[PDB]
């Protein structure tokens, strides 16, 4: 109809989704209210300006921001001096999502740089000369797989990598993040990711890991950093994805997990919050929403007959609306929420989330939902590794030619 | 000695007592990627840090240097590791180091390395005497600081300091009943002390939660806690629950109450309740109200729940295709 608003966030009924504080104000309600007011302005902007809303993903702008950042960064990034392989990964993945080719000059230079970050004893550090750490190791491996050349693959010293993972393994099934470092669910995921991709998983490498991860699921349904902690999307993604790699998703109460993640989508904003009673954030478009494709695959593997054949169990449209209207920086790059400054981390994750929300795929069945102009469509991302499905297949296949270190 | 921010701070390359050491520039390769254009101060400190790390110089000056490297980038885990090596080799007073870590955490509380360092110090000293009060101070500035709560659980568990935590939880819930971190802590304390099987405890908890739900019917945390503590035994195991929730439908409705009703129905149906059909329909009716009116953001979930209940609880569900 003519009076019908095609954008979910701009429909008149949508205003009913605003927060109800029951006249009891606390820090939480006050903070939530501030965000909703700012988001409401964004939504109402077209209306108060008397213009037809047009949701456009600023590709040219994002590309410029990425292309330059892949080479040089301002001192604003000094705080990430110990996370350079992450900068390589976030940027390369964002470019891959935007379907921008990686020049071989760039690819070779990234390879050589990552070789310098690689430790003599296995794993990659946050920069040349830094001790190895599982987070930079996960990022380095993902970045090399995105490049996907024989050179990229050859950078990874597999025997040492495996030795590194073993040196971090704990008796209770968990892993340290690095020697003399902390333990939390991120390590299980980082280890499972790199070990599965490079084909170095020995019979006992992950003994007890699945059980340890299962102990992280709490009364909320989600997964916390360590047993006993509040459920959080970042850790939940790590927990479920690692279990999926280990083929042990069944260790979790998938029903309570699904109920928890779906509740993390904000009724007004449309994006996801990281934990109950906190604020919406663009990066959770991936950490939280990315759980749905994983849950779908797990539930479907159990032959769940009630599973939709065209959509994920979240409001795909509303998430896309949130990202496109509230998380783009005019100058390029994406962000947490209006008022926050862009950064490569949120650029990588807002886009990864957008892609997931646009593409549904359950084997033979395939169904897309592209809000705004059709040029907004991105390349698909693998829900477990957050790299192109083709890069995943390509890498695993190549590494399966090599034998698991030791034999 | 010389703070990284004092107006008289001097670059290391201009310090006499450092004249014997050649700084070690960063090895980024012939043609760098993701190259950070560091400021003078930053690059200078790190060039000298690289020098001492490479020589494995375990000295007092190296120790003081790590403090500067840390303030420049507290996320540099390699620097923290070397600092811990120096704390042991130089036999540095660990309480003085505790004073240092408490100051650093006060300024950068959302960092992993600072909390891990504090933990190692506590482990080394085998002294948790300053913990609960320190953490309480951080939580007073950000009541939801994840690292703070995680460190708090570690301290409490490892040193069996359970005695006053429920009181602390009650205090914070009074300040902000919507603080999910506090509800999670509440569950942590109870499950590790009395447990929830003790009928008196469970009863008390549910009375408390329902009371909070009445004061703030839209606070999702109270709702998740109530479901959290009852769901494992089975919601259908508590027959009075349903009746009592329905009594809140008028002046205390919310998509949260509606969702709970569906969960009660779902379990009732799972445990062969009476009026199988009457229950199923009540449930599907609510799933539709939620998917189409009261909780549309979750329309895909609610449609799926409705479809699942239908798939396994309709009168036709156990009937052979031939009938």
């Amino acid at each position: 109809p003519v009076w019908s608003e095609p954008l979910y966030s701009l429909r008149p009924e949508h205003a009913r989704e605003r927060l109800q504080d029951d006249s009891v104000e606390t820090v939480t309600s006050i903070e939530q209210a501030k965000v909703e007011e700012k988001i409401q302005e964004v939504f109402s902007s077209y209306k108060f300006n008397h213009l037809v809303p047009r949701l456009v993903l600023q590709r040219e702008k994002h590309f410029h921001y990425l292309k330059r950042g892949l080479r040089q960064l301002t001192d604003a990034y000094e705080c990430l001096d110990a996370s350079r392989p992450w900068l390589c990964y976030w940027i390369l993945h964002s470019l891959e999502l935007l379907d921008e080719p990686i020049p071989q000059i760039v690819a070779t230079d990234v390879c050589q740089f990552l070789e310098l970050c690689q430790s003599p004893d296995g794993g990659f550090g946050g920069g040349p000369g830094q001790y190895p750490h599982l987070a930079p190791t996960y990022a380095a491996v993902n970045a090399l797989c995105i490049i996907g050349t024989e050179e990229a693959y050859n950078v990874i010293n597999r025997e040492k990598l495996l030795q590194y993972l073993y040196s971090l393994k704990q008796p209770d099934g968990s892993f340290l993040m690095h020697v003399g470092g902390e333990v939390d669910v991120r390590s299980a995921y980082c280890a499972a990711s790199v070990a599965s991709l490079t084909n170095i998983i020995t019979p006992d490498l992950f003994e007890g890991t699945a059980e340890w991860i299962a102990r992280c699921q709490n009364w909320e349904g989600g997964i916390g950093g360590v047993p006993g902690m509040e459920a959080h999307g970042g850790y939940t993604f790590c927990g479920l994805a690692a279990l999926v790699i280990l083929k042990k998703e069944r260790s979790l109460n998938l029903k309570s997990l699904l109920q928890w993640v779906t509740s993390r989508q904000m009724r007004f904003e449309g994006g996801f919050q990281g934990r109950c009673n906190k604020l919406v954030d663009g990066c959770y478009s991936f950490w939280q929403a990315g759980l749905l494709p994983l849950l779908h695959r797990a539930l479907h593997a159990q032959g769940d007959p009630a599973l939709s054949m065209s959509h994920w169990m979240f409001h795909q449209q509303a998430l896309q609306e949130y990202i496109l209207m509230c998380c783009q920086c005019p100058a390029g790059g994406l962000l947490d929420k209006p008022g926050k400054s862009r950064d490569f981390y949120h650029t990588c994750y807002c886009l990864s989330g957008l892609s997931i929300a646009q593409h549904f795929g359950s084997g033979a069945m395939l169904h897309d939902v592209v809000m705004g102009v059709p040029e907004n469509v991105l390349q698909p991302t693998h829900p477990v590794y957050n790299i192109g499905p083709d890069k995943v297949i390509q890498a695993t296949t190549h590494f399966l030619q090599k034998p698991v270190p030791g034999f | 000695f010389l703070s990284l921010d004092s107006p008289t701070y001097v670059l290391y390359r201009d310090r006499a007592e450092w004249a014997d050491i050649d700084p070690v520039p960063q090895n980024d390769g012939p043609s760098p990627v993701v190259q950070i254009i560091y400021s003078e101060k930053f690059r200078d400190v790190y060039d000298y840090f690289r020098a001492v790390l490479q020589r494995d110089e375990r000295s007092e000056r190296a120790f003081k240097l790590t403090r500067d490297a840390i303030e420049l980038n507290a996320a540099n885990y390699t620097v923290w590791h070397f600092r811990r090596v120096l704390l042991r080799s130089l036999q540095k007073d660990l309480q003085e180091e505790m004073n240092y870590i408490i100051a650093i955490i006060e300024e950068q509380p959302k960092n992993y390395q600072v909390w891990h360092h504090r933990r190692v110090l506590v482990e080394w000293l085998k002294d948790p005497s300053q913990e609960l009060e320190f953490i309480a101070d951080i939580l007073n500035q950000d009541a939801k600081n994840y690292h703070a709560w995680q460190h708090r659980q570690w301290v409490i568990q490892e040193f069996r300091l359970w005695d006053n935590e429920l009181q602390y939880v009650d205090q914070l819930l009074k300040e902000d009943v919507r603080n999910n971190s506090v509800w999670n802590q509440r569950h942590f304390v109870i499950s590790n002390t009395t447990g929830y099987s003790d009928r008196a405890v469970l009863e008390r908890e549910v009375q408390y939660t329902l009371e909070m739900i009445k004061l703030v019917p839209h606070n999702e945390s109270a709702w998740n806690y109530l479901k959290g503590i009852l769901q494992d035994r089975g919601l259908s195991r508590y027959p009075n629950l349903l009746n009592q929730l329905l009594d809140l439908q008028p002046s205390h409705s919310s998509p949260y109450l509606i969702a709970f009703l569906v969960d009660i129905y779902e379990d009732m149906l799972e445990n062969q309740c009476d009026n199988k059909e009457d229950i199923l329909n009540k449930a599907l009716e609510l799933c539709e109200i939620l998917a189409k009116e009261k909780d549309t953001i979750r329309k895909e979930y609610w449609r799926y729940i409705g479809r699942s209940l239908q798939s396994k609880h309709s009168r036709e569900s156990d009937i052979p295709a031939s009938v």
Binding site: C79, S83, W86, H133, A135, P136, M177, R186, G234, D281, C283, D336, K340, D343, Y345, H346 | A75, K110, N111, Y112
Partner: peptide, 6 residues
């Protein structure tokens, strides 16, 4: 502000 992940 920035999101910490490591």
């Amino acid at each position: 502000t920035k999101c910490v992940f490591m």
